[PDB]
Design an enzyme around this catalytic site. Sequence first.
Site, short mmCIF file in Angstrom:
data_model
loop_
_atom_site.label_atom_id
_atom_site.label_comp_id
_atom_site.label_asym_id
_atom_site.label_seq_id
_atom_site.Cartn_x
_atom_site.Cartn_y
_atom_site.Cartn_z
N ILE A 85 0.84 -1.19 0.00
CA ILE A 85 0.00 0.00 0.00
C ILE A 85 0.88 1.24 0.00
O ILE A 85 1.74 1.39 0.88
CB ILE A 85 -0.93 0.03 1.23
CG1 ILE A 85 -1.69 -1.28 1.36
CG2 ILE A 85 -1.85 1.24 1.16
CD1 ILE A 85 -2.34 -1.43 2.69
N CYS A 86 0.63 2.13 -0.95
CA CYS A 86 1.31 3.43 -1.01
C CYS A 86 0.41 4.45 -0.32
O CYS A 86 -0.53 4.96 -0.92
CB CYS A 86 1.60 3.85 -2.45
SG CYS A 86 2.37 5.53 -2.59
N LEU A 87 0.73 4.75 0.93
CA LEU A 87 -0.09 5.63 1.75
C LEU A 87 0.83 6.42 2.66
O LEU A 87 1.62 5.84 3.42
CB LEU A 87 -1.11 4.83 2.58
CG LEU A 87 -2.06 5.73 3.38
CD1 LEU A 87 -2.74 6.73 2.45
CD2 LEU A 87 -3.09 4.91 4.13
#
Lengths: 213, 211
Positions: A85-87
């Site tokens: 996840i790119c968060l």
Amino acid sequence: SMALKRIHKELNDLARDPPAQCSAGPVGDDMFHWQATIMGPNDSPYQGGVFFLTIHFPTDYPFKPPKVAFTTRIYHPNINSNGSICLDILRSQWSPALTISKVLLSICSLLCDPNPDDPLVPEIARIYKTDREKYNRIAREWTQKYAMGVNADVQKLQQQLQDIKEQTMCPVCLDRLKNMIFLCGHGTCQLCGDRMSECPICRKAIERRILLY
Amino acid sequence: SMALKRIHKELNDLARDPPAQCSAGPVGDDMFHWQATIMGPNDSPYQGGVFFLTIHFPTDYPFKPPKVAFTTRIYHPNINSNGSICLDILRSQWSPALTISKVLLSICSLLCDPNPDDPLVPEIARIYKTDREKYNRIAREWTQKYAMGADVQKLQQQLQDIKEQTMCPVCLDRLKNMIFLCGHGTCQLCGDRMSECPICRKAIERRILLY
Ligand SMILES: [Zn+2]
Ligand SMILES: [Zn+2]
Ligand SMILES: [Zn+2]
Ligand SMILES: [Zn+2]
Ligand SMILES: [Zn+2]
């Protein structure tokens, strides 16, 4: 340890104040490894799906962010085929005041409002930016494919103790009272505050630490 | 007014846990004029006597001290024939975080330990320093002359003394949302009306609002 105490605290708050849709907890006797569940947000193309995630808490949580990944395949610009996840909350924008609950809500918000300018799958970000209608159709198809199948007075004293705690407790440990204040107006306990260089709420650098008595 | 709310709060707290040595309350309907009574401590030569006092609250209490005076004659180095009391708690060491109960306890303490430092009656202070036995005899004689006329769940009420650590010490009503560099704090309303910290008395260098 501070990390294990904080993990127990988050678990109790999640149990006494459950989210309506999400869910998270220890898999077995390892408090530093959780499983989480997210229901497809109702106004998103993931509606109807159930997505599982693994959570891994570092030994010096919450000063360091947890490792969160999907284990259910999902069609999204910021989640790759390994479920990463790119968060921002999970790397640069991590604050020791955030909880797993907030992280799950931020992931649901990410599922509703992707960031296609920082993709993990460029072709999905391209579809999202060019043909929103087609992105939604495909995200629904992937959801269907992988993500489916004497007491009043005690209750008044408790409410009073609880609403005093909500306003005065340290936001990092949720355990001691804020006995150290920064010039930005926010504060922590001394124990958590000595382990930080920036305020956990507004992120401004800690110019000065004034202890309370 | 702030003064009237604080006077009622102190009166209620004097009702929920009255002080053993003292007693005080409104004379009639005047909340700003009280009568008080203190019993001569067994620790002093005033033991056995009951002494009456008047209490006067200024309109901007507690930022200005109350005016307290004896109406019963007493032989003491720091209390003169007008019933005036020489006690720093009533002027120089006054803090708006102090209450009538603390004041009455300080007056009983003064009765136990007079201060011949800068007294109000030099001759009595001289006797106190010179012929303590004669001081005691005269103090006793003046005493004789003028002064002889549930819990299983209440852990929470105990736990609620957390208020002591988080509530403003002036109004006891709001929370501490403003901090001075000395480490103590008040609510903004009380804090803006003070130039010195109500707990340690250092001059207020800066007021930091909390969120
Ligand atoms: Zn803390
Ligand atoms: Zn801040
Ligand atoms: Zn008067
Ligand atoms: Zn106040
Ligand atoms: Zn102070």
